[PDB]
Design a protein around this ligand. Structure first.
Ligand SMILES: *[C@@H]1O[C@H](CO)[C@@H](O[C@@H]2O[C@H](CO)[C@@H](O[C@@H]3O[C@H](CO)[C@@H](O)[C@H](O)[C@@H]3O)[C@H](O)[C@H]2NC(C)=O)[C@H](O)[C@H]1NC(C)=O
Ligand SMILES: *[C@@H]1O[C@H](CO)[C@@H](O[C@@H]2O[C@H](CO)[C@@H](O)[C@H](O)[C@H]2NC(C)=O)[C@H](O)[C@H]1NC(C)=O
Lengths: 231, 221, 221
């Protein structure tokens, strides 16, 4: 089973909430091991470490490396190249990666509970859909009141490509199941979405009991001195 | 590589729509073989060919037909194999699972900040709390079924509770605003093992995204 | 005044509920010579299985025989042919049965309760109407919430032929009585119809306490 090589974009959580930028490069298909080297056309500070190999399907040797300190050329839009040189290979390889232009930003929505889950009076669910963004990386975090809930209380699917209406775009969903006492008190829950193309990399939306399928809409308008020598 | 066999349950859409159901026990190994099945029922198994992938070995398979009525009634199957390249030939088994639960389906009306753009509106189906992870999701427009290349459904993950183990799945459909205004109607069907009539349906239109009573008060004082 | 034969169609109930299918060819006419014979065209799994000499009309007793497992050729388009030769009239006479064509899908409506009925606060009444379908074969089922209701709480008529322009279509109705306490509470109800021409074999319709919107606008001086 012949060798192959691939490059990987830096992780999303390490660019929005993180300071360091671990960029990596790997190599699969090897026989047992080697004494490989790696190359990167930017090298001013090349502290490239490798780490030990790992085993693959039916036994196969995979090896990789990493490169730190990469956030500013990534966001400015520089370029990076990788190549391998090891005994069980004839000629070196080649792969590059670049920060993707031609992007879009998500349209976040937050939906109220259905009407039938309000009568069973145990738990209710809140859906958070993000839609139509060009690179496929995204985050979702929930807040309760104004404090963040722990990650083990909700369920987030993966990003998938949606049917075509022009450019190719993606989508993702999530649900939170919350106690039906706090809904009828009047607490508020919020949903945050983090994407590469948004202005400050985060946005949020908020819902409570009095906003959404409310069966009730009051408004009072008071206009005080309507005939009153307006200058 | 390693010699290894599996079995597979019959697929769900063939147990639900079109009654010809199959059953499969494969084999993965050798860098000629025959298989035996324990309930005969006469119309015994065909054996087709060895495709090869996963940087391992060429792998042979086998298929037994006609497994609707014994599978639903609870009959355990076991398909044991035979090869030269094994030490003593392998064996596995499969059953129909019990202690199941059924899902509850929700169709959610579109959000209000989307009707203002006049492009397309989006509908959202949700199914929650069912014990085996097999499910089907089909959309409609009135009575006409829609082709599968028009919408998007996700996988079925596991939802984080404490009592039992349950699962969930979502799906979205985007229709045109001119047809939404006109009064047309759309549905989201869900098929599962545990339902007594194999399907359930929910329905929506441009009404019921309207509130029940409005109170406006203008005070000129 | 003829010792007769019969040929029929498979029953819609278990054709839709999945687990089997059948066909039936009976021989009537007398409680006499029992050289009852039958012969079918294919051999789908097993051949014919014959029962008792059944008691029938005032001395014209009858027999029957039934071919199992005819689901997939029926839904594919087989054109079956019965034959039978008994000695008390030694003519083997044949009859043809095939799956029909030019089907039409029904449309289902569920109508809310009248206003005089709800003011008495005794019970309510729902009504499920099905209209405009080409083969004369239907099923009705009433749910509640998500659980099925038993088949004795409600009533359904037969199926008649509506007169219209050229095209022959049919219609059925059925009604359900319900206490006013749970209709006042909010527990929902549903109606299901099963038909040969529907793509997923069923359609559902729910109802729940279609009320219009109120607009109160007030000006104060
Ligand atoms: C970054 O790496 C990519 C490889 O992923 C480089 O793109 C490759 O460019 C070469 C020539 O510049 C392409 O080869 C030629 O393609 C034409 C297509 O018609 C073919 O006729 C020729 O015979 C020859 O094969 C190659 O296809 C292309 N690869 C891909 C995936 O597009 C790219 O140049 C690199 N850029 C930098 C700045 O390093
Ligand atoms: C049917 O399959 C089950 C597994 O699905 C087999 O039972 C297990 O066998 C392994 C290895 O022998 C044991 O470690 C487990 O303790 C067994 N039990 C369970 C619950 O996993 C079983 O042997 C098979 N054959 C039968 C029932 O005839």
């Amino acid at each position: 089973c012949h060798p192959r090589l691939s490059l990987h974009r830096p992780a999303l959580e390490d660019l929005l909430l993180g300071s360091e930028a671990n960029l990596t490069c790997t190599l699969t298909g090897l026989r047992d091991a080697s004494g490989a080297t790696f190359t990167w056309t930017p090298s001013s500070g090349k502290s490239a470490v490798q780490g030990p190999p790992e085993r693959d399907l039916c036994g196969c040797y995979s090896v990789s490396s990493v490169l730190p300190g990469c956030a500013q050329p990534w966001n400015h839009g520089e370029t990076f190249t990788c190549t391998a040189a090891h005994p069980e290979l004839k000629t070196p390889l080649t792969a590059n990666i670049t920060k993707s232009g031609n992007t879009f930003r998500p349209e976040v929505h937050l939906l109220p509970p259905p009407s039938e889950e309000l009568a069973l009076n145990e738990l209710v669910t809140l859906t958070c859909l993000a839609r139509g963004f060009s690179p496929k990386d995204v985050l979702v975090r929930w807040l309760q009141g104004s404090q963040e809930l722990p990650r083990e209380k909700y369920l987030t699917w993966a990003s998938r490509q949606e049917p075509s209406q022009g450019t190719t775009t993606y989508a993702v969903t999530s649900i939170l199941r919350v106690a039906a006492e706090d809904w009828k008190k009047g607490e508020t829950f919020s949903c945050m979405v983090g994407h590469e193309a948004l202005p400050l990399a985060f946005t949020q939306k908020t819902i409570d009991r009095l906003a959404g399928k409310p069966t009730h809409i009051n408004v009072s308008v008071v206009m005080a001195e309507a005939d009153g020598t307006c200058y």
